[PDB]
């Protein structure tokens, strides 16, 4: 997270940190808790990854250093891609993985409503981007937990900051004109929360972006609510 600040613990009780095992334990990816048995994260954060079996989850995290040979974490069972995704600026960039067991919700970890296909009218303008990821460019994972406020940006004005690409209405974008605030290397996955009417909303899924917090250059995100009907079906056993 670009120009942001550190995170209360508890603040973001769905957001949970993706490691790799291999070659040594890392933070890879970000991700939220929508269920007891499942986190809504990224598909293209699994570039390279072969086996689940890698993967640990950690919830109620705040700080990276929390975590450690005997912290407790979450297996991952299956990592499920969206058929029809290719690469986070081509959509489609998301993916469910189902844990070996099951998250006992507390203060420190409960999951993140979805938003609803009702609430595609809504103009969320509180919403928040979060994760360990860069601060800066060229940078490194963070201890603590960060959050910015970010305002969205519509997709016809998303469009015209990337000719090159095209911003399906799969996607959502958030970032200041001038830049200085946005997700950067490390948040992918992470959620892109939006307190709405009291209740927090997961409306993206931290994608992609042209470098980080650039001017003109705002975030993309999963539009999370395009995707109802898919989590649905994937998370329906
Ligand atoms: C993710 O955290 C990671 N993806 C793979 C490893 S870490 C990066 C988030 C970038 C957010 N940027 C922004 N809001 N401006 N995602 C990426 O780096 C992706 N690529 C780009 N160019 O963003 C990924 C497809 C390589």
């Given at each position: 997270?670009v120009?942001?600040?550190?995170?209360?613990?508890?603040?973001?009780?769905?957001?949970?940190?993706?490691?790799?095992?291999?070659?040594?334990?890392?933070?890879?990816?970000?991700?939220?808790?929508?269920?007891?048995?499942?986190?809504?994260?990224?598909?293209?954060?699994?570039?390279?990854?072969?086996?689940?079996?890698?993967?640990?989850?950690?919830?109620?995290?705040?700080?990276?250093?929390?975590?450690?040979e005997?912290?407790?974490?979450?297996?991952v069972?299956?990592?499920?891609?969206?058929?029809?995704?290719?690469?986070?600026?081509?959509?489609?960039?998301?993916?469910?993985?189902?844990?070996?067991?099951?998250?006992?919700?507390?203060?420190?970890?409960?999951?993140?409503?979805?938003?609803?296909?009702?609430?595609?009218?809504?103009?969320?303008?509180?919403?928040?981007?979060?994760?360990?990821?860069?601060?800066?460019?060229?940078?490194?994972?963070?201890?603590?937990?960060?959050?910015?406020?970010?305002?969205?940006?519509?997709?016809?004005?998303?469009?015209?900051?990337?000719?090159?690409?095209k911003?399906?209405?799969?996607?959502?974008?958030?970032?200041?004109?001038?830049?200085g605030?946005?997700?950067?290397?490390?948040?992918?996955?992470?959620?892109?929360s939006?307190?709405?009417?009291?209740?927090?909303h997961?409306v993206?899924?931290?994608?992609?972006?042209?470098?980080?917090?650039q001017?003109?250059?705002?975030?993309?995100?999963?539009?999370?609510?395009?995707?109802?009907?898919?989590?649905?079906?994937?998370?329906?056993?």
């Open positions: 997270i120009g942001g600040t550190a995170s209360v613990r508890g603040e973001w009780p769905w957001q949970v940190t993706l490691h790799t095992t291999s070659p040594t334990q890392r933070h890879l990816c970000g991700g939220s808790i929508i269920g007891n048995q499942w986190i809504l994260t990224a598909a293209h954060c699994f570039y390279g990854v072969e086996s689940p079996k890698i993967l640990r989850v950690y919830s109620g995290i705040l700080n990276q250093a929390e975590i450690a005997d912290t407790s974490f979450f297996g069972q299956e990592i499920i891609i969206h058929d029809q995704y290719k690469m986070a600026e081509s959509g489609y960039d998301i993916a469910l993985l189902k844990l070996e067991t099951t998250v006992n919700y507390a203060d420190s970890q409960r999951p993140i409503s979805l938003p609803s296909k009702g609430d595609r009218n809504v103009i969320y303008t509180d919403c928040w981007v979060t994760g360990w990821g860069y601060r800066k460019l060229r940078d490194k994972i963070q201890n603590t937990l960060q959050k910015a406020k970010i305002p969205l940006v519509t997709n016809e004005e998303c469009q015209k900051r990337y000719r090159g690409h911003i399906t209405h799969k996607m959502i974008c958030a970032g200041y004109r001038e830049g605030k946005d997700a950067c290397k490390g948040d992918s996955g992470g959620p892109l939006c307190k709405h009417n009291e209740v927090w997961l993206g899924i931290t994608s992609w972006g042209e470098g980080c917090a001017r003109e250059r705002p975030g993309v995100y999963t539009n999370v609510v395009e995707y109802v009907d898919w989590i649905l079906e994937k998370t329906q056993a």
